[PDB]
Design a protein around this nucleic acid. Structure first.
Length: 114
DNA sequence: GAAGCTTTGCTTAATAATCCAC
DNA sequence: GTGGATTATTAAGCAAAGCTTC
């Protein structure tokens, strides 16, 4: 038989990832490395700040922020611009929002003014 | 539609880093 | 600086779902 594909990365995703890296280096975000895990680009921060651990551009059409024990009033600032949030029992924070040049910029700007 | 493979998303366990009273 | 614990980061684990071929 055959395996699953699994799932493509589109040209839009690379550019969006390019923009993320562009804005992170622009906003002084130091990256440990970039990973592809489950067909996703993960810019893993070496120095986690304000509980944020890495910035991700996922194939589901969303941009996500992965953190640990972030302050709620910090999380609220991200939810204030339309991002959803689910906090796990262990303190992990999951922030999601639809990919777009405007939304990616707004998310990183907020993270930079944190 | 179901079996048998996979990926996928996340939790839980395991390893490494940080406190704090002596 | 150490003993002895708690907490944070990395690796393994698990249920749910997707392809692919029945």
């Amino acid at each position: 038989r055959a395996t699953r594909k699994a799932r493509e990365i589109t040209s839009d995703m690379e550019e969006d990832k390019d923009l993320m890296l562009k804005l992170l280096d622009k906003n002084g975000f130091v990256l440990k490395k970039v990973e592809i895990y489950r067909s996703n680009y993960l810019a893993i921060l070496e120095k986690r700040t304000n509980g944020i651990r890495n910035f991700e551009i996922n194939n589901n059409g969303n941009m996500r922020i992965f953190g640990y024990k972030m302050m709620e009033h910090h999380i609220q600032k991200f939810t204030d611009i339309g991002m959803s949030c689910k906090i796990a029992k262990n303190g992990n924070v999951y922030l999601d929002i639809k990919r777009s040049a405007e939304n990616i910029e707004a998310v990183i700007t907020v993270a930079s003014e944190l």
